[PDB]
Structures are given as structure tokens and as C-alpha cells.
Design a protein around this nucleic acid. Structure first.
Ligand SMILES: [Mg+2]
Ligand SMILES: [Mg+2]
Ligand SMILES: [Mg+2]
Ligand SMILES: [Mg+2]
Length: 102
RNA sequence: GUUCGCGAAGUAACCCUUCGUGGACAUUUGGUCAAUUUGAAACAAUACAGAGAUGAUCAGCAGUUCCCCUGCAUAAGGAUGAACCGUUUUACAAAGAGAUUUA
């Protein structure tokens, strides 16, 4: 049991997004360079604007999905426990935090 | 202007006066700045509030700050000098079920 370290958590997050990129290519397949300017020193990479848009969309979708999966957790945990005496929400979140200690 | 020469005129008798002409002496101040409104002090007054830890009443001492003010100050005081008192979501996974799809 126990917790998962950050180097093991990062690999599992990297393994998970590779399966999201695998099925994204499978759902697409189901439906149907390097230039180095010598004067400036800058390196320009030419890439597809669709794959850059799909990168920007999927990060926003994962940002909203974790935002909504946490918002429902806020609305559920506020309306679970009311037995022990509280005063405000920061007291409830602290007295619940004492319960996970024991 | 002074002084050292030189030349001419007059008085002289080689000295004085006069005006011509070479030298020498002395040689570069001040402003970062213009004299009332438009290149910048600040108080006071009026209005509106009105002193931290509190259940009430009383001492304070710090800290953080791209706020300082008094003071000789590395002392101390400025309400414990003031401001602080809010807003708060992703380093995120692993297991186990029902609806909607796909081709
Ligand atoms: Mg006091
Ligand atoms: Mg006092
Ligand atoms: Mg203080
Ligand atoms: Mg003080």
C-alpha cells in the first residue's frame, strides 16, 4: 500500500496520456522539419496547426474535467457530515482533517 | 598707465616740455542657478468613520512590506506607528459498476 512517489506518479501520468493519444489516433483512423537561421541562431520547427490545436484543446479539456471532478467533490463533502459541532466551512474541513489522521 | 630706449620740434646749450616710434610690465571672470500663476513641501478646516489580541476592561514586544514620520541616534516614540484580517482547484494516478457511441 502506501503513497506513490512523484517519479512514479509522473510516469503513470505519462503512460495515461499516451493511451489518450493512442485512442485519439484510433478514433481518427476509424473515421477515414528543422530550419536553423545562421544569423539569428534561432531554430524554427514547422508543424501541423491541427496537432497544435488538438494539444491546446485537450489541455483545456483535462483542466475543466479535473475542475468539475473537484467541484462535485466540494459539493458532496459539504453535505455528507454534520454530526460533530462546527462553526464555518474552514472548521468543518479541519475537523474532517482530524478524522483522516485517525 | 609706468619704465627702458630712439627720432623730431621748441626752450636749451645735451638738461626740460611736446608728440612720433620700438621694447618690457600686466592676459581670459561667471552660471548645474533668469524675476509672481504652468514642473510640483506641507498643515489646517468641512463631511463621513472612529483604537489589537475580548465575554468585558487593561500592558505591551516583535515580525513581513517596492509606506514611513519624529529624533543626534544602532535609544525611544509614532494606536502594540500604520498596512496585515481578503481571494483560495490541475506534479494527480490506480482499481471496480450502469447509460450513450464507434466501425
Ligand atoms: Mg493600546
Ligand atoms: Mg503608547
Ligand atoms: Mg509595529
Ligand atoms: Mg515601536
Amino acid at each position: 500500500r502506501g503513497g506513490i512517489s512523484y517519479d512514479q506518479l509522473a510516469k503513470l501520468s505519462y503512460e495515461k496520456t499516451l493511451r489518450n493519444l493512442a485512442t485519439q489516433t484510433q478514433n481518427s483512423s476509424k473515421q477515414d522539419k528543422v530550419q536553423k537561421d545562421t544569423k539569428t541562431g534561432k531554430i524554427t520547427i514547422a508543424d501541423d496547426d491541427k496537432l497544435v490545436n488538438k494539444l491546446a484543446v485537450s489541455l483545456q479539456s483535462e483542466s475543466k474535467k479535473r475542475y468539475e471532478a473537484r467541484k462535485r467533490q466540494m459539493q458532496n463533502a459539504k453535505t455528507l457530515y454534520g454530526v460533530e459541532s462546527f462553526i464555518n466551512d474552514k472548521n468543518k474541513q479541519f475537523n474532517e482533517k482530524l478524522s483522516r489522521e485517525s
